[PDB]
Ligand binder design. Structure first.
Ligand SMILES: OC[C@H]1O[C@H](O[C@H]2[C@H](O)[C@@H](O)[C@@H](O)O[C@@H]2CO)[C@H](O)[C@@H](O)[C@@H]1O
Length: 477
C-alpha cells in the first residue's frame, strides 16, 4: 500500500461520508490525503487482499470478523494509552479483544430493532405470531405487514434465537467451539415460523436489503427490521417511523446478535502511526463521531462523552433495549463458518430448496465441523464432501474419521481444502477401489417421494473429546 496516505474501507450501509469529512479535516491539518472506499462484500475481500500485503490501511467492520482476521495475522496490535482507553466503554474494548490483545478500535454498538410506520400502524404488534393476521388486514388496503432482508442471516437470527437457537455456547469466560446451537428445537421452531410466513405469502423469499428498504421508505409495508444506520434514509422519506422492541416469539424475546462497529489496522500498512493518530485524535472525538453519526446513525457509540448525549435519542434507547435482550457476537474465527452455514440454510428453507430440519442439520454440521456436502439430484452424478477448516488455534478437530457403508476412512484437517467423493449405492462406480458409499436410501415419513442417504463422521478434538456428526442427501425417487 502507498506510504504517506491513508486508505479506509467501510461498508456501504455506513456513515462513509461523515468519515470522509473527518478524512478531509485530517488531510487539511496534516496534509495527508485520506481516501474512503466502500467495496461490495468487503468482509470477504479484506482478508484476501490483506494476505497479499495489499488493501486499505484501516478496515471498518463489526467485531465478529476480526478474530478471523487476527488469527491469520492481518491486523496490527492496538496499544492505546490508558487515558484514551478511558474515553471508551470497557465493554466495547472487550469486544475487540482477541487472545488477550486489542486488535481494533471500538466505535459503536449495533443491534436490530423493529421499525414501524406510525401513520399506518400506531400500535405495532408485540409478537411474531400476530404478523399474519395483521398482514391480511393490510393486504386488503394495498399494503403489507413486514418486509426485511432475508438474504443475510443476521436479520433472521433474532427469530431463530428467540426459542433457544445459539451460535456457540458461552461457558464462564470462554466460548465452546464444540457446542453449536443451530440444530436445536428452538432454531427449528423459529425458522419454521419464518418459512410458514413465506408459505402463506405474508413475505417473499427473494426480499433483500434494497427491496425492504424501498418498500418501507415508500410506505408500501408497515414494518421492517434494521439497524441504526438505516434511520437517516427513513428521515429522508415521508414516513413517520417508530423504533421499538423486536416482536416476541413463543412468549420469548427476539435475540439479536449485538455488533460492535470496529476499526482495524492492516498489518501490512506502513502508515500505522498515522492511522492511530487519525482514529484516536480525529475519528474518535465528539466532532468525528458527530459527523459520522449525522451521516448514518451509529447506534450507541463507544465514546462516553457523546453517548451521554445520545442516550436522549429514543431510537438509541430502543437499540440498547433490543441489545440487552440479545447476545454479543463471538469474535472467534469459527463465526465465519457459522455465518456461511446459517445463510445457506435460511435461503434454502425460505426458497423451498430444503426442509427446515435438513437445512438446519446441514448448517449445524457445517458450522461445527467445517463440513459441506454437495448433493446431486442425479444419483449417477456422485456427491462431494468438503472440509474447509477456519479455526487453527485452541480447541480444534485433530482427527476426522468418515464412516461409509463400506468402511472407515481418515481425512486430514490441515489449512487448505480437502474434498472426497461420496457415492450412492447401486451406481456403476458404487463399488470401486477407494470409493466411499452412502448409507441409504431411508424412507422420509413426511414425503413419500424422497429418499435419504447419509454418512457419519467421528471427530477427535485436540483435548481428546470425541464428537459425532452426520451428513445427509435427499433425492427424488
Ligand atoms: O449476515 C451475516 C453478517 O452479519 C453481520 O453483518 C452485519 C453487520 O454487522 C452490520 O453492521 C450491517 O452492515 O449488516 C450486516 C449484515 O448485512 C456480521 O457482522 C457479519 O460477519 C455476517 O457476515
Amino acid at each position: 500500500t502507498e506510504e504517506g496516505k491513508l486508505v479506509i474501507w467501510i461498508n456501504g450501509d455506513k456513515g462513509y461520508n461523515g468519515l470522509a469529512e473527518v478524512g478531509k479535516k485530517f488531510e487539511k491539518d496534516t496534509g495527508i490525503k485520506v481516501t474512503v472506499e466502500h467495496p461490495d462484500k468487503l468482509e470477504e475481500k479484506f482478508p484476501q487482499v490483506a494476505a497479499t500485503g495489499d488493501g486499505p490501511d484501516i478496515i471498518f467492520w463489526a467485531h465478529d470478523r476480526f478474530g478471523g482476521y487476527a488469527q491469520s495475522g492481518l491486523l496490527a496490535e492496538i496499544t492505546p494509552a490508558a487515558a484514551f482507553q478511558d474515553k471508551l466503554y470497557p465493554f466495547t474494548w472487550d469486544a475487540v479483544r482477541y487472545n488477550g490483545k486489542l486488535i481494533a478500535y471500538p466505535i459503536a454498538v449495533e443491534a436490530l430493532s423493529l421499525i414501524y410506520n406510525k401513520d399506518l400502524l400506531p400500535n405495532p404488534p408485540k409478537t411474531w405470531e400476530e404478523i399474519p393476521a395483521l398482514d391480511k388486514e393490510l393486504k386488503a388496503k394495498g399494503k403489507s405487514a413486514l418486509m426485511f432482508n432475508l438474504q443475510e442471516p443476521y436479520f433472521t437470527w433474532p427469530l431463530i434465537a428467540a426459542d433457544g437457537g445459539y451460535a456457540f455456547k458461552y461457558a464462564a469466560g470462554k466460548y465452546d467451539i464444540k457446542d453449536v446451537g443451530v440444530d436445536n428445537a428452538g432454531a427449528k421452531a423459529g425458522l419454521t415460523f419464518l418459512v410458514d410466513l413465506i408459505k402463506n405469502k405474508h413475505m417473499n423469499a427473494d426480499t433483500d436489503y434494497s427491496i425492504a428498504e424501498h418498500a418501507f421508505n415508500h410506505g408500501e409495508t408497515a414494518m421492517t427490521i434494521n439497524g441504526p444506520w438505516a434511520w437517516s434514509n427513513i428521515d429522508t422519506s415521508a414516513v413517520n417511523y417508530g423504533v421499538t422492541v423486536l416482536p416476541t416469539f413463543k412468549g420469548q424475546p427476539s435475540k439479536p446478535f449485538v455488533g460492535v462497529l470496529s476499526a482495524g489496522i492492516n498489518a501490512a500498512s506502513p502508515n500505522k502511526e498515522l492511522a492511530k493518530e487519525f482514529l484516536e485524535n480525529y475519528l474518535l472525538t465528539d466532532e468525528g463521531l458527530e459527523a459520522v453519526n449525522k451521516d448514518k446513525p451509529l447506534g450507541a457509540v463507544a465514546l462516553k462523552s457523546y453517548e451521554e448525549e445520545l442516550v436522549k435519542d429514543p431510537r438509541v434507547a430502543a437499540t440498547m433495549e433490543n441489545a440487552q435482550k440479545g447476545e454479543i457476537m463471538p469474535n472467534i474465527p469459527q463465526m465465519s463458518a457459522f455465518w456461511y452455514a446459517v445463510r445457506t440454510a435460511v435461503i434454502n428453507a425460505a426458497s423451498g430448496r430444503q426442509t427446515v430440519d435438513a437445512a438446519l442439520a446441514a448448517a449445524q454440521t457445517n458450522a461445527a465441523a467445517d463440513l459441506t456436502l454437495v448433493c446431486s439430484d442425479d444419483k449417477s452424478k456422485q456427491a462431494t464432501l468438503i472440509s474447509y477448516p477456519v479455526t487453527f488455534k485452541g480447541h480444534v478437530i485433530k482427527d476426522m474419521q468418515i464412516f461409509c457403508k463400506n468402511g472407515w476412512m481418515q481425512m486430514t484437517r490441515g489449512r487448505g481444502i480437502n474434498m472426497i467423493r461420496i457415492h450412492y449405492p447401486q451406481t456403476y462406480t458404487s463399488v470401486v477401489p477407494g470409493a466411499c458409499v452412502f448409507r441409504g436410501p431411508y424412507s422420509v415419513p413426511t414425503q413419500d417421494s424422497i429418499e435419504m442417504y447419509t454418512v457419519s463422521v467421528a471427530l477427535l478434538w485436540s483435548d481428546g473429546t470425541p464428537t459425532y456428526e452426520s451428513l445427509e442427501c435427499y433425492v427424488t425417487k
